Amino acid sequence: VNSFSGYLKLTDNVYIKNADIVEEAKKVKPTVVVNAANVYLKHGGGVAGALNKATNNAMQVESDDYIATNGPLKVGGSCVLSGHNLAKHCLHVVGPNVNKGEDIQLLKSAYENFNQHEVLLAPLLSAGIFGADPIHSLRVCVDTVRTNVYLAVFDKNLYDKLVSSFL
Ligand SMILES: O=C1[C@H](Nc2ncnc3[nH]c4cc(F)ccc4c23)CCN1CCF
C-alpha cells in the first residue's frame, strides 16, 4: 500500500491521473519523482522548468554542479539527484526531443531507467515540448516499465484521450 490517491489503474504496474506533477509531488513526497530532463540538465520549461521553479532554483544549482563534474547525460540516459522539497530523489531522465531530431526509438531506453526504482511518480517521457505523441509514450511506458509507475498528466483533455484510447 502506498499514498498515491485518485489514480486509474491501466495495468498490473502502471497508474495514471490528471494532475500537476509539482502539486502531486508536494503532496505525496514520493521516494522518486521523474524529471523530463535534457542532457545539459537545463531546466527551462515544460515539466523540468516547473519542477525546478518549485525548488526555488535549487534543482538547477545542483544540476549545474553535476554537469560541471560529469558532463552531459546521454539521450535515453538518466541520473539520480536530490528531490529537494518535492521527493527524496529526482530521477532526471532524458527522452528524445523530436523538435531536435532525436531518434524516437531511444524512448524505450529512457523508460528502462525507471526499472531501477520500485515506485516512481513520473510524467510521460518525450511528451509536451519534447514533441512526441503522448499516446505512443504511454504505450512504450506500459511495455517497458515493470516497476510501479504513477503517471501525472497535466492536461485534462490529453488525459481523457490517453484513457479512452488505451488498449
Ligand atoms: O500535460 C501534459 C503532460 N505533462 C505534465 N504532466 C504533469 N505535470 C506537468 N507539469 C507541467 C508543467 C509544464 F510547464 C509543462 C508540462 C507539464 C506536465 C504530458 C504532455 N502534456 C500536455 C501539454 F504539455
Side-chain angles (χ1 to χ4, degrees):
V1 176
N2 62 52
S3 164
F4 289 103
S5 173
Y7 286 74
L8 179 70
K9 182 169 179 59
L10 295 176
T11 68
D12 181 65
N13 65 296
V14 179
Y15 295 80
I16 196 169
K17 184 182 179 178
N18 172 222
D20 184 342
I21 192 172
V22 170
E23 288 308 309
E24 187 76 7
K26 281 194 289 186
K27 158 173 116 57
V28 176
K29 295 298 238 77
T31 305
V32 180
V33 66
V34 173
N35 182 32
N38 60 53
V39 297
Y40 308 109
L41 302 179
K42 286 174 60 94
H43 309 302
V47 169
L51 290 170
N52 176 57
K53 178 178 176 184
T55 76
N56 183 43
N57 211 50
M59 177 181 285
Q60 190 64 66
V61 171
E62 178 195 31
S63 293
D64 287 351
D65 171 82
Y66 173 93
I67 296 287
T69 297
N70 299 109
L73 296 179
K74 298 170 181 178
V75 179
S78 70
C79 67
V80 180
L81 291 172
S82 179
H84 301 275
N85 52 317
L86 304 179
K88 188 173 191 299
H89 304 107
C90 179
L91 182 69
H92 295 272
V93 180
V94 183
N97 189 326
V98 177
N99 305 318
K100 301 179 180 179
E102 293 167 352
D103 176 14
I104 194 61
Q105 299 297 133
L106 290 169
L107 187 54
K108 187 173 185 76
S109 301
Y111 273 116
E112 287 171 342
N113 295 284
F114 289 25
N115 289 321
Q116 300 295 316
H117 303 277
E118 289 194 354
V119 182
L120 315 88
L121 171 62
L124 284 168
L125 297 180
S126 298
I129 69 175
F130 281 63
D133 177 2
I135 296 176
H136 175 66
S137 183
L138 176 56
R139 188 74 259 166
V140 178
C141 181
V142 163
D143 294 340
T144 305
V145 182
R146 298 177 300 283
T147 55
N148 291 143
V149 57
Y150 290 84
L151 295 166
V153 177
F154 180 59
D155 189 71
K156 170 61 173 169
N157 286 324
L158 173 60
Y159 170 84
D160 287 348
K161 180 188 190 131
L162 287 165
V163 168
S164 290
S165 62
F166 183 72
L167 228 194

